[PDB]
Amino acid sequence: VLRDNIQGITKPAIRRLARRGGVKRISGLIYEETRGVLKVFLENVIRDAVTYTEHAKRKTVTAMDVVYALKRQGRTLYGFGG
Amino acid sequence: KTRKESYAIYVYKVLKQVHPDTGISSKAMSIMNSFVNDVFERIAGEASRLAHYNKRSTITSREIQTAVRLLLPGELAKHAVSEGTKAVTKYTSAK
Amino acid sequence: PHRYRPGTVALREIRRYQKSTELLIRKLPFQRLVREIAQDFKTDLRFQSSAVMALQEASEAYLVALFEDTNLCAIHAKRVTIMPKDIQLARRIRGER
Amino acid sequence: AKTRSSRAGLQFPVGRVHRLLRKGNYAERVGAGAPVYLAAVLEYLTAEILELAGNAARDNKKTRIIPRHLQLAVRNDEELNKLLGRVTIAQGGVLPNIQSVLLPKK
DNA sequence: ATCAATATCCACCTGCAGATACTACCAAAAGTGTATTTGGAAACTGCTCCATCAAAAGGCATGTTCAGCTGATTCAGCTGAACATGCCTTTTGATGGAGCAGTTTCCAAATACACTTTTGGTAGTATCTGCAGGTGGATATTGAT
């Protein structure tokens, strides 16, 4: 029963996210749009974090790699160091 | 009667290289000068941070290179990286 | 035989999830996706557990806020149903497009 | 006595760039290759923009690059647009762009 | 309206995950003292360019008219919410090993430093040139009919 990883981001899970965002009613096409948006979000951030990993000569992406990538994308995160 | 540096003559040199019969207005030059300063500050800054993050006191062409990859989009990064590598490689063999 | 009307449970859920702070995507599937995306930038990577966690926290905060904007965009057009064109508008105005 | 610019094969002043890195308080030390690499990236970028802007000037039957030409060059190029996504070029105006539903008839 | 299903509220119970208190320790700040460097306020003044003002040059304010857009109304049909459960994916925890991180090492490359050369900026005076804004005069575009 092979399944694409992005589809692992399921309808109910996207439904829950919308709910926290105060959304009452959701169009069937929203689930695919959301996955695309998440993909671009993660590409942009992971790209930069990996770039930090490579610079340090590591094979492990660290929380700090991620925290620094988030800071420069203007999405500062508190709770994981720095 | 204090001296005020700019990248003007260098911008003009490069301009003649690419469009030998084209000039530049002083306002356009002012904008070119601002752009160069701006990108300089953005790359040096990333380099600065990167160095701090790795507990290093030295900014080397390696720091600049990561800064370039962090700052520039896709294809501009790729090409800036070649041009910078090329210049340093050439520079190393030239003394 | 008992049946709640459309929107009744949806409200009940908005209240529920606005009260809590747990992550709403299952950890494992999110982790696979992260690794898949990263594989295109560098092969044979390992991830600190907290690194994945950081990414999930950031990704879920992002999407939650995007849904709020999206919801305003639906309501601006006098609807109560969110559509991709609402997500699209929100991203264009945010300057992500 | 050959300039460090000519040594690296560059128009942009490597000396000047080395100096600005020191005065700029970016780290304790500046490596010798840093201003070389940086000056080249700087030179590359300005060649990219003057190329495109020169074209806009020609397209406009003009011989002198003005700020409108820099704007057209930057906004018409996906990557320069994103790189200067939060920058304003004075006297650049905007790209001609009218939304569909605004046009007459059907 | 009544009525019954089911969600929600609260008081009380408790095991343990996560908070905290305590001791012995050491490397490493943080502080104290003395010898040395310099950054910048102040005091003076050349001189750029800002506020100010008078005449000239063109955009703004206003009222009338109606085209067509917005918002209300109604309606049918499409499309997403609600629903119940065993399949199947995720979570939990137990266990080898990869690699991050701590440590010592030693030299390529860093800073410092002092005469020596080069050059980018400006400043005073000169001649050049791209194109803005004026013109007339041939080619659309638009809206009445």
Domain D1-106: homologous superfamily in CATH: Histone, subunit A (1.10.20.10)
Domain count, chain B: 1
Round to whole Å and give the CA distance between C25 and B73. Answer: 30
**CB contact set of B24 (below 8 Å; sequence gap of 6+):** B11, B12, B15, B32, D50, D64, D65
The residue among D93, D38, C62, A70 whose CA lies nearest residue B48 is: D38
Round to whole Å and give the CA distance between C43 and D84. Answer: 32
Round to whole Å and give the CA distance between C94 and C87. Answer: 11
C-alpha neighbours within 13 Å on the C-beta side of residue B41? 6
Contact A61, C45 (CB under 8 A): yes
Residue ranges with strand state E in chain C:
46-47, 81-82
Pairing of strands A25-26, C81-82: parallel
C92 touches strand E (CB under 7 A): no
Q: What is the DSSP string of B8-27?
A: HHHHHHHHHHH-TT-EE-HH
Domain boundaries, chain D: 1-106
The residue among D22, D68, D15, D11 whose CA lies nearest residue B8 is: D11
Ordered alpha helix ranges (H), D1-106: 4-8, 14-23, 34-59, 67-75, 78-83
Structure tokens belonging to residue A71: 């800071």
Residue B59 has φ and ψ, to the nearest 5°, of -95, 115
Q: B55: which chain A residues are within 8 Å (Cβ-Cβ)?
A: none
Contact: B66, A55; criterion CB under 8 Å: yes
B94: helix, strand or coil: coil
> What Rg do the C-alpha atoms of chain B give, in angstroms?
16
Contact: B54, A56; criterion CB under 8 Å: yes
Contact C94, A73 (CB under 8 A): no
Round to whole Å and give the CA distance between C48 and C29. Answer: 16
Residue A60 has φ and ψ, to the nearest 5°, of -115, 125
Q: Which nucleotides of E are covered by protein (CB under 7 A)?
A: 5-8, 79-83, 88-91, 98-101, 109-111, 117-123, 130-132, 142-143
Structure tokens belonging to residue D88: 């304003």
The DSSP secondary-structure symbol of D30 reads: E
Residue type at D14? V
| CATH 3.90.550.10 matches C1-97 | no
Residue A70 has φ and ψ, to the nearest 5°, of -55, -45
Contact: B66, A64; criterion CB under 8 Å: no
User: Which residue is closest to B77 within chain D, CA to CA?
Assistant: D41
The DSSP secondary-structure symbol of C11 reads: H
State the burial class of residue B5 (Cβ atoms within 10 Å of its Cβ: 0-12, 13-18, 19+).
exposed
Touching chains C and B? (3+ Cβ pairs < 8 A): no
C37: helix, strand or coil: helix
The residue among A40, A24, A12, A11 whose CA lies nearest residue C82 is: A24
Q: Which domain holds residue B93?
A: 1-95
**CB contact set of C53 (below 8 Å; sequence gap of 6+):** A63, A80
Round to whole Å and give the CA distance between A63 and A53. Answer: 10
Round to whole Å and give the CA distance between C48 and C59. Answer: 17
Residue ranges with strand state E in A2-77:
25-26, 60-61
Please identify residues in chain B, positions 1-30, with a C-beta within 7 angstroms of any atom of strand E. Answer: 1-6, 8-9, 23
Structural domains of chain A in order of their starting residue, each with its CATH number: 1-82 (1.10.20.10)
Contact D59, B94 (CB under 8 A): no
The residue among A63, D12, C46 whose CA lies nearest residue B17 is: D12
Tell me how close the Cα of B4 comes to any Cα of chain D, in angstroms.
13
Contact C17, C24 (CB under 8 A): yes
Round to whole Å and give the CA distance between A37 and C63. Answer: 8
Residue ranges with strand state E in chain A:
25-26, 60-61
Contact: C67, A17; criterion CB under 8 Å: yes
Round to whole Å and give the CA distance between B58 and B61. Answer: 10
D72: helix, strand or coil: helix
Resolution in A for the shown PDB structure?
A: 2.6
The residue among C23, C8, B92, B80 whose CA lies nearest residue D46 is: B80
Round to whole Å and give the CA distance between C49 and C55. Answer: 10
Tell me how close the Cα of D83 comes to any Cα of chain B, in angstroms.
7
Domain boundaries, chain C: 1-97
Round to whole Å and give the CA distance between D35 and D15. Answer: 8
Q: How many residues does chain A have?
A: 82
Residues A63-82 as b/e (b if ≥16 CB within 10 A, e otherwise) read: bbbbbbbbeebebebeebee
Contact: B53, A51; criterion CB under 8 Å: no
The residue among D20, D36, D13, D19 whose CA lies nearest residue B10 is: D13
Round to whole Å and give the CA distance between C47 and C34. Answer: 10
State the burial class of residue B26 (Cβ atoms within 10 Å of its Cβ: 0-12, 13-18, 19+).
exposed
Residue C61 has φ and ψ, to the nearest 5°, of -55, -45
How many Cβ atoms sit within 10 Å of the Cβ of residue C35?
A: 16
